[PDB]
Design an enzyme around this catalytic site. Structure first.
Site, mmCIF file in Angstrom:
data_model
loop_
_atom_site.group_PDB
_atom_site.id
_atom_site.type_symbol
_atom_site.label_atom_id
_atom_site.label_comp_id
_atom_site.label_asym_id
_atom_site.label_seq_id
_atom_site.Cartn_x
_atom_site.Cartn_y
_atom_site.Cartn_z
ATOM 1 N N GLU A 147 0.853 -17.303 -1.032
ATOM 2 C CA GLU A 147 1.564 -17.030 -2.300
ATOM 3 C C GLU A 147 2.666 -18.077 -2.477
ATOM 4 O O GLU A 147 3.802 -17.902 -2.053
ATOM 5 C CB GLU A 147 2.097 -15.602 -2.306
ATOM 6 C CG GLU A 147 0.995 -14.591 -2.557
ATOM 7 C CD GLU A 147 1.251 -13.220 -1.966
ATOM 8 O OE1 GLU A 147 2.415 -12.776 -1.899
ATOM 9 O OE2 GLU A 147 0.255 -12.580 -1.560
ATOM 10 N N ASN B 174 4.100 -8.034 5.839
ATOM 11 C CA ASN B 174 4.823 -7.131 4.949
ATOM 12 C C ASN B 174 4.380 -5.678 5.112
ATOM 13 O O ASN B 174 4.523 -4.871 4.194
ATOM 14 C CB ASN B 174 4.616 -7.595 3.508
ATOM 15 C CG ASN B 174 5.721 -7.166 2.583
ATOM 16 O OD1 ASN B 174 6.909 -7.206 2.935
ATOM 17 N ND2 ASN B 174 5.340 -6.792 1.355
ATOM 18 N N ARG B 175 3.850 -5.342 6.278
ATOM 19 C CA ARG B 175 3.392 -3.991 6.533
ATOM 20 C C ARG B 175 3.982 -3.328 7.784
ATOM 21 O O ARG B 175 3.681 -2.169 8.061
ATOM 22 C CB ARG B 175 1.860 -3.999 6.638
ATOM 23 C CG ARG B 175 1.137 -3.187 5.566
ATOM 24 C CD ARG B 175 1.348 -3.742 4.172
ATOM 25 N NE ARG B 175 0.581 -2.986 3.190
ATOM 26 C CZ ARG B 175 0.292 -3.413 1.967
ATOM 27 N NH1 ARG B 175 0.706 -4.614 1.542
ATOM 28 N NH2 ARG B 175 -0.432 -2.631 1.170
ATOM 29 N N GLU C 134 7.365 -9.753 -7.930
ATOM 30 C CA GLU C 134 5.913 -10.019 -7.911
ATOM 31 C C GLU C 134 5.463 -10.576 -9.255
ATOM 32 O O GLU C 134 5.706 -9.984 -10.301
ATOM 33 C CB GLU C 134 5.173 -8.709 -7.609
ATOM 34 C CG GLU C 134 3.672 -8.765 -7.665
ATOM 35 C CD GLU C 134 3.073 -9.307 -6.395
ATOM 36 O OE1 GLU C 134 2.669 -8.509 -5.517
ATOM 37 O OE2 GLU C 134 3.030 -10.544 -6.266
ATOM 38 N N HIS D 213 6.761 -13.037 -4.157
ATOM 39 C CA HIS D 213 5.319 -12.791 -4.125
ATOM 40 C C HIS D 213 4.559 -13.280 -5.395
ATOM 41 O O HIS D 213 5.113 -13.328 -6.509
ATOM 42 C CB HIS D 213 5.099 -11.285 -4.015
ATOM 43 C CG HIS D 213 5.417 -10.724 -2.675
ATOM 44 N ND1 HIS D 213 4.917 -11.258 -1.509
ATOM 45 C CD2 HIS D 213 6.150 -9.650 -2.311
ATOM 46 C CE1 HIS D 213 5.341 -10.545 -0.482
ATOM 47 N NE2 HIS D 213 6.091 -9.565 -0.940
ATOM 48 N N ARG E 130 -2.748 -15.999 4.088
ATOM 49 C CA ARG E 130 -1.920 -14.781 3.952
ATOM 50 C C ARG E 130 -1.164 -14.436 5.242
ATOM 51 O O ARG E 130 0.043 -14.226 5.233
ATOM 52 C CB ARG E 130 -2.764 -13.597 3.517
ATOM 53 C CG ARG E 130 -1.953 -12.353 3.214
ATOM 54 C CD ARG E 130 -2.881 -11.222 2.776
ATOM 55 N NE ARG E 130 -2.227 -9.941 2.482
ATOM 56 C CZ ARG E 130 -1.466 -9.701 1.418
ATOM 57 N NH1 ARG E 130 -1.196 -10.654 0.530
ATOM 58 N NH2 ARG E 130 -0.965 -8.493 1.235
ATOM 59 N N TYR F 284 4.724 1.558 2.563
ATOM 60 C CA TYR F 284 4.523 0.711 3.729
ATOM 61 C C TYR F 284 5.859 0.004 4.039
ATOM 62 O O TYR F 284 6.720 -0.145 3.166
ATOM 63 C CB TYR F 284 3.344 -0.286 3.527
ATOM 64 C CG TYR F 284 3.335 -0.933 2.167
ATOM 65 C CD1 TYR F 284 2.723 -0.315 1.090
ATOM 66 C CD2 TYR F 284 3.993 -2.143 1.943
ATOM 67 C CE1 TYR F 284 2.765 -0.887 -0.173
ATOM 68 C CE2 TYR F 284 4.035 -2.716 0.682
ATOM 69 C CZ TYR F 284 3.422 -2.083 -0.364
ATOM 70 O OH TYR F 284 3.449 -2.639 -1.604
ATOM 71 N N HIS G 273 3.779 -13.829 2.596
ATOM 72 C CA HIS G 273 2.378 -14.238 2.652
ATOM 73 C C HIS G 273 2.275 -15.715 2.371
ATOM 74 O O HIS G 273 2.756 -16.184 1.338
ATOM 75 C CB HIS G 273 1.593 -13.468 1.641
ATOM 76 C CG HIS G 273 1.677 -12.010 1.862
ATOM 77 N ND1 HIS G 273 2.106 -11.137 0.890
ATOM 78 C CD2 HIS G 273 1.434 -11.263 2.966
ATOM 79 C CE1 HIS G 273 2.082 -9.903 1.368
ATOM 80 N NE2 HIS G 273 1.679 -9.952 2.628
ATOM 81 N N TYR H 235 -6.554 -7.578 -1.439
ATOM 82 C CA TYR H 235 -6.819 -6.157 -1.216
ATOM 83 C C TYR H 235 -8.299 -5.797 -1.054
ATOM 84 O O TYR H 235 -8.605 -4.658 -0.698
ATOM 85 C CB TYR H 235 -6.193 -5.288 -2.323
ATOM 86 C CG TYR H 235 -4.642 -5.284 -2.425
ATOM 87 C CD1 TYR H 235 -3.827 -5.860 -1.449
ATOM 88 C CD2 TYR H 235 -4.002 -4.653 -3.506
ATOM 89 C CE1 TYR H 235 -2.440 -5.850 -1.572
ATOM 90 C CE2 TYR H 235 -2.615 -4.630 -3.628
ATOM 91 C CZ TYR H 235 -1.833 -5.230 -2.660
ATOM 92 O OH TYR H 235 -0.453 -5.203 -2.774
HETATM 93 C C1 LIG Z 1 -0.363 -9.299 -3.716
HETATM 94 P P1 LIG Z 1 1.048 -9.127 -2.612
HETATM 95 O O1 LIG Z 1 0.645 -9.316 -1.193
HETATM 96 O O2 LIG Z 1 2.209 -10.138 -3.061
HETATM 97 N N1 LIG Z 1 1.686 -7.521 -2.747
HETATM 98 C C2 LIG Z 1 2.644 -7.036 -1.778
HETATM 99 C C3 LIG Z 1 3.320 -5.844 -2.446
HETATM 100 C C4 LIG Z 1 4.789 -5.754 -2.144
HETATM 101 O O3 LIG Z 1 5.533 -6.712 -2.436
HETATM 102 O O4 LIG Z 1 5.202 -4.689 -1.652
HETATM 103 C C5 LIG Z 1 1.962 -6.619 -0.505
HETATM 104 O O5 LIG Z 1 0.761 -6.271 -0.598
HETATM 105 O O6 LIG Z 1 2.584 -6.611 0.588
HETATM 106 ZN ZN LIG Z 2 2.536 -11.120 -1.195
#
Ligand SMILES: CP(=O)(O)N[C@@H](CC(=O)O)C(=O)O
Ligand SMILES: [Zn+2]
Ligand SMILES: CP(=O)(O)N[C@@H](CC(=O)O)C(=O)O
Ligand SMILES: [Zn+2]
Lengths: 303, 302
Positions: free
Chosen positions: A16, A62-63, A170, A108, A55, A156, A13, A280
């Protein structure tokens, strides 16, 4: 095992920044993340998002490391992050193959007050569970927490899921688009100990069994809304910043402007994580609820 | 004789407290109405609130000047320039006497500033008096006054339209986030501001008074690479230390290798907007200010 190919991902992202800032410096000088007998490649996963300090460009990177997307026919009609995901699969994977990287760390930040956080994708992976225990132990007296995102349907497909041993690191709370020095120092320690762990392991150190507390996802919860779908109540002050800490069914959770308290409800305690994460609101997740349980690992050794 | 009051929200679309209050207040303005005082709530940048982003084409809160407000209305203009006009026409025009009397413009910052008030003119007795009543009312909750008037460095705000422009700024808060404690603070700030206006329109007399403000002197960037990339970040001793004194000995930035970069120069300063997300693109790691006293004559009305 014996551990060969290790990567560190930053900028999954683009807003970050701690990972992007580390990774950019380590691309210019790797000493810190090199260990004797162990090469480590740092990498910027979403460079277009990094440039727009956002982002993502088209969708969340990351999905989407799954078959649906990684198997699609490569073209220019596709979302940038989809195009990009395949390029990463090709450089560091392929996902589910032995020719993949052994370990990928994905860096992250979060606006939630979660401290040092490790993300476990597999409840019965002795290697990762040993890693995390080593890190926890090394960080002390500094807290370190383990979010277990394994679920029949809620897991995910992460950038790092590519690897044999995917790791997510994180660190919060930090505003998006900001570099805080104290957050930076924490991600670095986290990483220092992880790479120390690998090295140790690679030199045939034996680890006895261990156990760790982790927080297992049960359910994500949205902010309460209008018939217009606009937010009707926000994170109650008592829940603000109380990530990881136990939340009982009578306890306050939301607050309206008026302002009446909306409590938890249901008939069991839960551990909230990702409380008021900026990114989120879009995904309708005001908070995740977790059960806290203890996992074990067997002994492990190299060859 | 203070007739037209507005509260602006969403000048920046990712600073959510104000959006949240203004959107609620549009549906039920009781909180901000006062006995014989009509105060209009308004969303300044509705499109940037939709995308939840600071702005679309450019920062709405810098362009309420002649250069922009004199442009010919047109679909080819940057959105925020089109909006600045539309707004000017509703609540101004700026420099006219038909302009609104007071405009409160609501903001959030990622910097640890607490409750803060933005003074655009160091002479205005009415504001100084208002700012005294608020600061004092809020206590012991700290509240601070940032004075941005300066020969070259003042920028043309959304509220500068009015005879009495007031900026309301609360932090620290991440963008994209609604924190309850911040929400609460902001609305105590407005509670007291509207209360003061009412007290003034009821004839109540205000004696002379002094307040401390923080006068802008210059803005500094993060130190950079040969490539214009950021090479040091805010030192941990300066992080979250807005308003507190910083002496030339003291440390300002930190490099990845561990090198501390000190303040330097020849006098103490009081930094403001330390590590504000939105100022990274404006290349302002921090603003430096001198502490200063401002005196107001007493005032009444008729
Ligand atoms: C707040 P973020 O975007 O760093 N959290 C990750 C969570 C992760 O690292 O799996 C995400 O939502 O993809
Ligand atoms: Zn992130
Ligand atoms: C951090 P912010 O966007 O609330 N700061 C304002 C300062 C102000 O209110 O004048 C601005 O940059 O326009
Ligand atoms: Zn703002």
């Amino acid at each position: 095992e014996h551990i060969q190919k290790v990567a560190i991902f930053g900028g999954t992202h683009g807003n970050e920044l701690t990972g992007v800032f580390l990774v950019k410096h380590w691309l210019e000088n790797g000493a810190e993340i090199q260990r004797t007998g162990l090469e480590v490649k740092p990498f910027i996963t979403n460079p277009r998002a990094v440039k727009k300090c956002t982002r993502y460009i088209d969708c969340d990177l990351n999905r989407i490391f799954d078959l649906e997307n990684l198997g699609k026919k490569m073209s220019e009609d596709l979302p940038y992050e989809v195009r990009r995901a395949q390029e990463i699969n090709h450089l560091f994977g392929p996902k589910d193959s032995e020719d993949s990287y052994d370990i990928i760390f994905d860096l992250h930040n979060t606006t939630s007050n979660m401290g040092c956080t490790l993300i476990l994708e597999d409840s019965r992976n002795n290697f990762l569970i040993q890693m995390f225990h080593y890190i926890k132990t090394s960080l002390a007296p500094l807290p370190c927490y383990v979010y277990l995102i394994e679920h029949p349907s809620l897991k995910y497909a992460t950038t790092r899921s590519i690897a044999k041993y995917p790791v997510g690191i994180e660190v919060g709370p930090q505003p998006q688009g900001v570099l805080r020095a104290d957050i930076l120092d924490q991600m670095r320690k986290m990483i220092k100990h992880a790479l120390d762990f690998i090295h140790h392991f690679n030199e045939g150190k034996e680890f006895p069994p261990c156990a760790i507390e982790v927080y297992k996802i049960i359910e994500k919860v949205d902010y309460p809304r209008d018939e217009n779908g606009e937010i009707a109540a926000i994170i109650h002050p008592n829940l603000q910043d109380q990530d990881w800490k136990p939340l009982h069914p009578g306890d306050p959770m939301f607050l309206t402007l008026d302002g009446k308290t909306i409590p938890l409800g249901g008939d069991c305690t839960v551990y909230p994580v990702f409380v008021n994460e900026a990114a989120y609101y879009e995904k309708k997740e005001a908070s995740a609820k977790t059960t806290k349980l203890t996992l074990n690992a067997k002994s492990i050794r190299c060859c």
